[PDB]
Structures are given as structure tokens and as C-alpha cells.
Design a protein around this ligand. Sequence first.
Ligand SMILES: Nc1ncnc2c1ncn2[C@@H]1O[C@H](COP(=O)(O)OP(=O)(O)NP(=O)(O)O)[C@@H](O)[C@H]1O
Ligand SMILES: Nc1ncnc2c1ncn2[C@@H]1O[C@H](COP(=O)(O)OP(=O)(O)NP(=O)(O)O)[C@@H](O)[C@H]1O
Ligand SMILES: Nc1ncnc2c1ncn2[C@@H]1O[C@H](COP(=O)(O)OP(=O)(O)O)[C@@H](O)[C@H]1O
Ligand SMILES: Nc1ncnc2c1ncn2[C@@H]1O[C@H](COP(=O)(O)OP(=O)(O)O)[C@@H](O)[C@H]1O
Lengths: 573, 567, 112
Amino acid sequence: DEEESLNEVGYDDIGGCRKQLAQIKEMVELPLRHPALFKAIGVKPPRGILLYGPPGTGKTLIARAVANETGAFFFLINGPEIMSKLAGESESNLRKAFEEAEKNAPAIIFIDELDAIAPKREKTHGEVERRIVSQLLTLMDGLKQRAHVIVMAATNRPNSIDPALRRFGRFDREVDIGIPDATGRLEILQIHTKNMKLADDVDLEQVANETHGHVGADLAALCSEAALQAIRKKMDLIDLEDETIDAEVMNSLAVTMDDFRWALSQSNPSALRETVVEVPQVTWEDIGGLEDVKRELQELVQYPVEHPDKFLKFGMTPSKGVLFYGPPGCGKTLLAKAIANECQANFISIKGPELLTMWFGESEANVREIFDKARQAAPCVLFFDELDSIAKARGGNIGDGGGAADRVINQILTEMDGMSTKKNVFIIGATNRPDIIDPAILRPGRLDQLIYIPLPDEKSRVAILKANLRKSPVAKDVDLEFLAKMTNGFSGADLTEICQRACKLAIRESIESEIRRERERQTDPVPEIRRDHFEEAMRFARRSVSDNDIRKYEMFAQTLQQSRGFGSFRFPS
Amino acid sequence: DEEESLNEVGYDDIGGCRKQLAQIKEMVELPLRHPALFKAIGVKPPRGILLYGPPGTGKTLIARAVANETGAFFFLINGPEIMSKLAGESESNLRKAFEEAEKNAPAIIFIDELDAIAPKREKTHGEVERRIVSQLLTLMDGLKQRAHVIVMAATNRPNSIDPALRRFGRFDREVDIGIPDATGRLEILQIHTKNMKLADDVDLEQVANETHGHVGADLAALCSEAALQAIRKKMDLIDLEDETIDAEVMNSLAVTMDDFRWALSQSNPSALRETVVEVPQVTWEDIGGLEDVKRELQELVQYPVEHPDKFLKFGMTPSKGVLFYGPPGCGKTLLAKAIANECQANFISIKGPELLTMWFGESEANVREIFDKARQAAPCVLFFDELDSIAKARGGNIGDGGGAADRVINQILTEMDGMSTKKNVFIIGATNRPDIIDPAILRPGRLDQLIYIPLPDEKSRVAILKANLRKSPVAKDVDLEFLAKMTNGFSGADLTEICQRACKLAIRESIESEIRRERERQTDPVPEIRRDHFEEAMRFARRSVSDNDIRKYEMFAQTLQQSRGFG
Amino acid sequence: VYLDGDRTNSRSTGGKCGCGFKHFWDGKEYDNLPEAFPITLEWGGRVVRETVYWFQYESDSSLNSNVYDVAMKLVTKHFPGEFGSEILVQKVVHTILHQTAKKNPDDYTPVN
Ligand SMILES: Nc1ncnc2c1ncn2[C@@H]1O[C@H](COP(=O)(O)OP(=O)(O)NP(=O)(O)O)[C@@H](O)[C@H]1O
Ligand SMILES: Nc1ncnc2c1ncn2[C@@H]1O[C@H](COP(=O)(O)OP(=O)(O)NP(=O)(O)O)[C@@H](O)[C@H]1O
Ligand SMILES: Nc1ncnc2c1ncn2[C@@H]1O[C@H](COP(=O)(O)OP(=O)(O)O)[C@@H](O)[C@H]1O
Ligand SMILES: Nc1ncnc2c1ncn2[C@@H]1O[C@H](COP(=O)(O)OP(=O)(O)O)[C@@H](O)[C@H]1O
């Protein structure tokens, strides 16, 4: 019959959002269940909470969870529903809701979509809409701690509400429900697949890792498509689309890993173009050599965030960014990812094309938004890749006759020189052409530290080769040391290419052998990579960085070192 | 109601607003307490007062405070409350107020959100709104019969009200409630933490210093967040749910300094992207050497204001500007802050990136705003840094088909030429490429004085080293005199770099020693910077400017001196 | 004294001259002989012509010519105290670096 009471929304159904749920419990449940606790200290509880989030993230799920898991009186006001009523009656309904809730206590009020109730004031093309907004403002300011009434609201974007509603005494406290991470996606998948019958080879961890831009709605759609594929696969020739289906085939339904793979193939994530904010999965083991640079990075980033007392004692201002320079493809991004991972701080990457888009599009104001996002994810590491891309585009050594200043780097400087030092937002830049960079960047208070990343040596090449082969099942007979000794002027990318070519040759040989064996039988030869392949793949080896190109970097580093000629300073004593 | 009666706000609850509160008291209480006095002098009392200020600076708080002291009469009008009524009823509402306050004793009428009922005329399309604006204008004009009624209004920003409401007889007077300074934030914190048990370790002075771009609402939110984190930290392990908290853990609840540090860490200030107008905290003690420049700068900004009669007697117009030129980094920025601090005048700083932003964005009209902020906050010092940035970015020297003239410096000159000498607004420019500066700036009457800031000499170097080190412990064996004798060519930033490197080495050693000593527990070595740290730090030292740049600046200065041959 | 590039008593180590003796140049004792390359300068209207000597093959690594110092000396000797002369430094650095390439390891023609 009506067994919908078994299908409800509790705090267990909301997966991947634990911190936000904790905040909601803090500022929506405690104030109206223990009123005297805030009275004893003497602080006023908030009178309005707003919920951010891209579409399909779970904003309305929390509404139902709080509605049926609080015990206090709950009143629901749909956004579009209140606007569909005739003019004059909508105000009557809104006033009736706000008066009826106040009669009871506590009286949590949830407004689903107020972006359809109170849009931007200039965009309110009409007259009744402004009257509705004003009526909302008057009722909200009438809550003088009366019966402990708290108002909640949900929106797809903060920058669509009338700014008058984000003042003191109004919706001023906001939560930032966002894109789930890998663990969140795995938890959501485990929540959704709690009812259907899975097979014994379905590992949801692989599915969670493979999906990149999905949100809760997308994961639900993926599960539905997997179930549909499972139904269509075998029961289609048994099902007849008439009368009733046999109970035997009906009960005996399993969703295999192949169906999930097929469903994942036919998937369209709705958050691909968003900026990824997550802790990198790269550790110090993925990087070979560069031991000293790791120490310097740990000193620069980790010390000021762990021992503030020491810095306060000696009166020193911590550095606020570094600039890497060196030959291309040597690990200038792996270092940033690793240093972000070690300190457990979020990582936001801005690539060269991202900068070039703003220079062409005349939209450098977007730079501000970036520095807002990092400010919302402290502690965070902000990485700028190819800072010289704009300078390289403008002619290079011989430009259009202009100075060493452009539109986007200037905005970056303006925004960097105006951030509070209390926040922990480290800034890292990378450029393989350190001579055409804007000299204004290197001024103190900015990216003033210079670190040189050289080409790897023999031991470091051994380390790189060993690190990159943790996936390929190579036989224990090839001497990687000999390869490192022979390959002298190679960067990391070249060694990775050598490994990729060896793997490709092995795959091709295995496929050909399998096809020939099957053809012969119509009437695992190579389960691992052996020595000969690496020989053949060695013929297609080229040096990415020429021998006449490292002179620039070596001479630049030599001059920068030679400028420091006071190493013989000795006190008389 | 018991607590509500004795919790009514008053004059004592306002924070850093001292001058503004005095002005409001002067413009309201006097024309009502003693109406006859204004008749004796003959000056007519004001009729309208408007309050500026960014959101959450206590604009409506002053309204409630005023409607406790001036016990004559008070009627409150809300913008959204008026606009939420049905059309026709809203217009019929205001009249009642403007007759009720007319029927009774000397009364005050406060309109809370003025911009909610009187926006820009052309920027808003509608019919009822225009009728409301016309009704308000008619009532304010007709209230001229002098029934001892004063109308007050508040808004977030003046450049949103219908300009017809800014004329004479209608909101002519204005009061600006700006962002609090360091002392104001401390006073607001002391006001807020009154009925809130605290611990003895927390000092509010540090909190006031560190919270840079906050306003009153932000400070209240910070205090609330600190209290909430105090609840979460310790008591949250006892009170779970559905129970009643015993008084033993209720009364024994206190807020520590770490809670305030955390609450400060997780706080985004509202009024952060706004120019800071405050008296600097830099005195002559932080600057080494430059003795002649100090006197030449004192006799240019301080004499005209201290002794106006002397200037009037001799008929010499005080200088309005000065230009600093020299190698990159010698204290050019420090001198401006020092001279603004000695005279106790507000300081407004404009850097090179702001000029480049106005040049790229084609928004040179913003300069008209900047001087306005300097005009209201008089006396003031206006500082422009890197005036050559635009010329440098446009190619430099003979780099393109240009003539050293752009769209931003032109606006600066246009606005500076229209400054009245009655208001003391001194303007200081700084550059390190004097050869490419616009010659129109140096014309007399805009920036006449041209001061050369050279590299420090030995005595100045000793003074700089001593001034930059009186913030951290230093062992007595360190001999700064030998360092100053040995450097012989460093600018004013290289010495600071050396000191920073020494402090960094000391921090590294101390942390390493602590980590090493924290290993035997399962089984203050460096209290002050020693003289061996400086020896290591001197290894990573480099000259910022070579002898060639000194040659360039010396040649420029000697050409200027040779041009001036008299005597 | 030694004038320039003479068969001194100091023994050449790995020199390509084959005489086994070091060579003297600009107050210093070198192994091989430098090349020569013409360079034109045109900053500030005035145009000058100069020759640059490049040392690339040598035993000790602290003796090989450094471009950022050679260009700086060339600019300073002919344009002392000129404002904003670093553009000329960058241009001459790029020119000499491009024209000093060693695509094939046989472009060794030292001046007598
Ligand atoms: N954390 C989650 N766990 C499980 N399912 C989720 C989660 N988040 C979202 N969903 C799915 O998304 C549905 C709710 O829609 P939601 O994600 O709130 O879309 P919305 O457009 O943001 N909501 P609204 O604008 O209020 O209609 C749920 O019923 C689930 O199907
Ligand atoms: N000077 C001050 N001293 C003490 N508390 C202050 C001060 N300024 C602001 N506050 C606090 O911060 C709050 C700011 O809100 P409010 O006074 O409504 O400012 P507003 O945004 O200008 N108001 P409105 O007139 O509705 O636009 C006050 O109500 C006090 O709680
Ligand atoms: N030190 C290193 N150890 C291991 N792999 C490296 C190292 N340096 C570069 N790589 C390889 O280079 C690739 C990434 O290059 P990247 O660092 O992004 O180039 P760039 O430094 O130009 O950004 C990775 O696939 C990695 O395998
Ligand atoms: N004469 C000086 N006395 C003390 N400190 C100085 C002096 N000159 C430079 N400094 C130091 O240099 C730092 C920055 O110098 P600044 O004045 O900003 O350079 P510029 O004049 O180019 O703006 C300051 O923090 C200051 O401590």
C-alpha cells in the first residue's frame, strides 16, 4: 500500500557532504534546541542561512532530511509555486506562512528557490515582483528573536539574488555545497546501489575513480542506465512486453561490471568545465631526484603553517610565492602537486591557455574570481603555468615595440598585493623563458624566490625510469642502469615516451600472436615485456631539449650565482 | 517584557563614530532644545540630513540611539515597508506621518532605506515609483513652514538617490560614516564583549590591530564565531542532544585567545577592496639618514598650515607638489608616510598597478573619484608611485610613435589643476625613470620641487640596520658597524633582505633543534640571533644597482645642477 | 712580458692548437684561441662596429665565455650611463647567441 514511509530521507542518505552537514547541524539545530546556551555567552544566533551549489548537487535533499529529522515545526515554501498565484494572493500566502510559523516554536522555514522570488533588482522587469521582494524584506526584518524562527533558502548561484537580501539581519550565513571528490562519489554510488542486485565482480571503487565531473544526479543516472542495460542484455529475448514477466527471470537479475562500463561510456558529465579543487594524489615517490628542492619547498610552505609562534618570536614575514624556471618537461608541475599533497591543502591549477583566453577575450576581471575561489579554500596552493605565454605571444625577443607589461599580469599583481596575510594561499609560477618575464613580478612581497630545475643526472634518470614503470609488468632481466647510462641528455618526458613505446610494441606483438594462434586453432605468449622490445623502442628516441638550448639556462644561473660575491665576509672577533 | 526594556540602545553603544556623532548631535539637538538661539544669530536650522557609508557601519543604529536621547518625538519610516504596501495606500501612508509629526512637538522623521523608495529616475521604469518620489519631494518642500521638524535619511551610497533629493532644502546636509580605524575597531570590540565572559590571556589590542578591513558588522560576526568555536572546542564533548545543560558547565565557559585566532582565520572582511584613509603609523625613527630631506619636506607641508599668517603677509603661495626620483628602493615611500604622520593628516596611496589598470580598462574617469576622497578627508597627502609605469609600458624612450602623453596622466593633471588652496591636499609623486616622465607634470603649480634620493652612505647604513633590527632579539656580539663598512653600495632593500635571511636561518635552526629534542621523550637552544647567522646570510647577498645605474643618476643630477648656475 | 697568444712555457692541456703551450689573451693565460664575430650597435642614433671574441672550448669551466657578461661589457664600454640600455643588452645577447651556434662540431676557426 502506502509503504513510502520506508523510503525517506535521513542523514545517512546524504553522502559526500559531511562538513556542510556538520555546519547545518551547528547553526540550525543547536540555536533552537538549547536557547539558553547562546544566552549564557550572549551572542545572537543567525537569522538566515543560504545554500550555494551547482545544479543537481543535493540542495533539496538536505531540506527534506532536516524536515523529517528535526522534530521542530517545519514549513516548506516553494519558489515557483508562490509566484504562480494571482497578484495579491501570493503576498497573502507568504504572510500567512510567516505568521503561522511564528505561532509555533521552533519554526524552521525553508524557501526552495528564491532566485525566482527575489531576482536582481535591476532585472526585475515589472512592478509586482519588486512588491514581492519588498514584502519579503519587511517580514524578514520583523523577526526580533520571536519564538526562535530560522529561515533557510537555496540557490544555484549567489550572484542572482537582490543584494539587499545579503545584509545584516538577512541571509548572511552561507554554505558552499560543491562538486564531490573521489571518496564522495564512491559513497554516493554505495548509497544508490544499496537496493539493486549486483554481481560478484562489480568493484564500485573503479567506477568512482573513472568518473571525473559527475555529480549526485549524474551518478544516479549512471546507475539507472546500468540497470537498463542489464535488463536489455539477456531478458530482452525472454521478455515479451505482454501479460506479465516470469518471476524466474525477474528475480534472477544481476548487473555486471560490463554493464557499468557501458553505462559509463554513454555518460555526459554536467560539471566538466568547472574548476577542480581537490587534494592532489601525487606523493614524493612519483618524483625522482630533486632532493634539495623538496627541502626548500617544505621550508617555504610547511613551516609557516605549523610553527606560527617561531615566526612571531623573530618578527619575520613569510614568503608568499615561488617561481620555477628551467628546461621544459622536468617536473615543474609534479613538485607543486606533491607539496600541495603533503600539507593536505587544496590545489587550484591555472594553465597557459586559461591565461591566453583572458588576454584575447579582454576579460581580465575574471582573475579576481580566481583569487576569490582560493580565498574560499584556505589553505590552498595556486599554480600558474607558463607565465611567459602572453609575453611569448607578443613577438618574444623582438615584440611589437611595447614594454614588458600586459593586461592580465597587471591584474594578477593588483590582486596579489591586496590579500590578507592571515590566509594561507601560497602562489607558485612556472616559466621556461625566465628572461622575458615581467621584472615587476620579482619585486619583494611577490614571487621573489627563484628556483632552478635542471636536467636530471644519471642517478636521477635511474630513479625516473624505476618510478615510471610501476604499471607495466616488466620482466626482471633488463638493466635500467644501462639505459640511464646511455641516455645522457634526456628529460623526463623522453623517458616516459620510451616506456610508452615499449608498452605499445609489447601490446602489438601480443595481439598479433593471439590472432595468429586463434587462426591456427580454427582448423599468453607475451605476459610481460622482455629485453628486445626496449631495444627496438630505443631506436625511436630523440632528445627533446637540444644541446645548444641549455646554454641559456646554464649561463643565466651562473650569472645569478655570480652576483653573490660576498662569501668571504668574516667578523673580526 | 523585562530584558527588552533595559536592553534599549543608547549613545553609549556607538563605537568609533565620535566626530560624526558630535555633528549629528549638533545639527539636531540644538535646533530643537533651543529654537530661539538660532533666531538670535539669524542662521536658519537645517532641514535634511543624509548618512553615507558602506553596509554594516551602524547607520540605522544611530537612528535608534537618537530616538532615546532626544526625548521630543520620533517617527520611523522604512523603505521596504512603504514599498510593500498596495499602490495608492503607500502614497496615502507617508502623508499621515508628515502630518502626525507635524501635529506634535518638535519631531524627527527617519527614513531608513532611502534608495528603496527614491532610486535614479531614468534608471528605473515604472509608474508608482515616480509617484512615490514626487510625493516625497512635495512633502519635504511643503514642510518649510518651520514646525520644528527635521527629516533624516540613510543610504548605502549617495550616487543612487534621485538627484532631485540632494538640492537645497531637501537633504542638503550630509554625514559620512566611514570605515573604523585601529582605535575604532578596539572600541567596538570592547563594546561588543561587554556581556561575554572571557579569559585573561586575550588582549583586544592585537585583535584590533590584525583585523584590517573589517566594519562593525564584521567585528560582531567575528565575536560570535569566536564564541561558537569556544562552545564547539570543549563543552561539545558533554552536551549531546535532547538533554538539559547543567549550570556547572554553563557558568564555567570562557573564550581564549586561540579561539579568537581561529575565528580571525576563518573570516572574510567585507570592506576590503576600498582605499584606506587613515593616519600612518610610521615616524622619523624608522628612516635612517636623509637629514636634509626631512627639513625640506617639513618646510613644505607643515609650515603652510601652522603659520597661515606668515604666508598671507609675504604673499607666497604654498607648494602643492613634489617629485622623488632615485634608484629603486631607498625610502621614497617611507618619507611620504612619515611626513603624513608628523602633521597628523590622512594618507591615500595609489600604486602603479592601479594606474595601469585605469590605462588598460579605458576608465580614466575613475580619477575624478580619487581626489574627491582626498578632498573630504582634509588635510590629506596623496601619493602616486611609479608615475613612469605607463610610459615604460608603452615602449620607453624612442620605442614607438609617441610623445610622452597618455590618457591617465592627463586626467591627473586636469584634476590637480582644479584644487583649491584653502583645503590642504599635498600631492607627492615617485619615480625611478625621470628621463621618460611627462614634462607637463613638472610645470610649476603642479609638481615643482624635484628631490633626489641617493644611495645611503655609511652612517645612514648604520641607522638603517639599527632601525630594521629593533623588532627581533639580537645578541650583543653582533657588530653592525662592520657590516655597514663592508657593504658599500647596497640600497635600502638589500639590508632588509639580509636581515630576513638571518631570521629565516635562525627559524630553521630552532625548528630543527626542537624536532631533534622531541625524539628522546619516547625513550631554548637559540633564544637570540647569533653572529654566525649573519656570516652565512651575507653569502646570499647581491647589489641591486650596479655602478652604471649610479652613473646614470649622477649624470642626470649633474646636468640639472649645471643648468642651475647662479652666484 | 707576453703580448698575445704566444708559445709560453705554460703547458697547454687539451688545446686544439697542438703546440702544447698555453696562449695569452687580454691579461689571461688560455689554452686555445678565440673566434671573432662582428657586431653592430645603433642605440641612441649613434652606430658603432665591434668585434667579439668567444671562448667555448676550454679545460676549466670557470674560464669559458659568458654571454651576459660579454654583452654587458660591450654595452658599458660604448654606451656608459645611457638610460634604459638593457634593451640593447638583450638584443645583443640574442644576436650573439643565435650567431654563435655549433650545429656541426667542426666550426672551429680561431683567429691567428
Ligand atoms: N549526496 C547525494 N547523495 C545521493 N543522491 C544525491 C546526492 N546529491 C544529489 N543527489 C541526487 O539528486 C537528487 C536531488 O536533486 P538536487 O541534487 O537537490 O538538484 P537541485 O536542482 O540542486 N535541487 P532544487 O533546485 O531544490 O530542485 C536526489 O534525490 C538524488 O537523486
Ligand atoms: N559603531 C558601532 N558600534 C557598535 N556596534 C556597531 C557599530 N557599527 C555597527 N555595529 C554592529 O553591527 C551592526 C550593523 O548593522 P546596521 O546598524 O543595521 O548597519 P547597516 O548595514 O548600515 N543597517 P541599514 O540601515 O539597515 O542598511 C549593528 O547593528 C551593531 O550590532
Ligand atoms: N623528476 C621526475 N620523476 C619522474 N617523472 C618525471 C619527472 N619529471 C618529469 N617527469 C614526467 O613528466 C611528465 C610531466 O611533465 P611536467 O612536469 O608536467 O612537465 P613541465 O615541467 O614542463 O610542466 C610526467 O608524466 C612524469 O612522468
Ligand atoms: N633609509 C631607510 N631607512 C630605513 N629603511 C629603509 C630605508 N630605505 C629603504 N628601507 C627599507 O626598504 C623597504 C622598502 O623600501 P621602499 O621605500 O618601499 O622603496 P621605494 O622607495 O622604491 O618604494 C622598507 O620596508 C624599508 O624598511
